[PDB]
């Protein structure tokens with residue numbers, strides 16, 4: 773089968789896992805269950821009217837697990853790097869995650885920068901335009917989402933899939 777190989781990266785608590793579960797299961801939980809190490813989903817699905825093997829690695833944002841991540845980045849055609857629009861540190865820290873992807877794959881990768889939690893726009897600390905500007909500077913795609921609301925979650929996956937050969 774064709775593969776659709778993604779890795780989710782980003783600081784702790786930004787909503788990596790929640791994006792994945794909203795997409796795959798239409799499921800969201802307010803309760804925080806930290807990802808420990810690297811979790812994995814492999815599923816045969818239909819993409820754009822073809823059978824595709826999804827291989828999705830969901831990494832922990834905690835620094836203590838970061839040493840595990842390079843081999844998973846190496847095997848991933850798509851890297852999804854997530855931040856929380858309410859947390860400026862999480863936004864600036866996307867740089868190291870993108871650098872980690874470049875270290876392993878150079879330009880031979882699709883990267884999507886995601887500003888998540890737009891349902892919390894009252895608490896927004898990073899503008900949409902700041903995100904767009906950073907993405908363009910780094911030569912990566914950009915989207916804003918809300919895993920909680922189910923906003924732009926399917927679109928995230930559609931857009932990275934559309935970039936696959």
Ligand SMILES: Nc1nc2c(ncn2[C@@H]2O[C@H](COP(=O)(O)OP(=O)(O)NP(=O)(O)O)[C@@H](O)[C@H]2O)c(=O)[nH]1
Pocket residue numbers: 782783784785786787788789790791801802803804805806807808831832833834888889890891892917918919920921
């Ligand atoms: N309001 C709101 N909360 C969200 C959103 N996405 C995730 N959360 C919340 O933020 C917390 C962390 O979410 P989670 O998906 O576990 O984040 P993660 O990036 O996978 N964390 P880790 O790196 O620890 O695995 C949870 O309490 C979850 O409910 C969102 O779009 N909006």
Ligand SMILES: [Mg+2]
Pocket residue numbers: 788789790805806807830831832
């Ligand atoms: Mg997680």
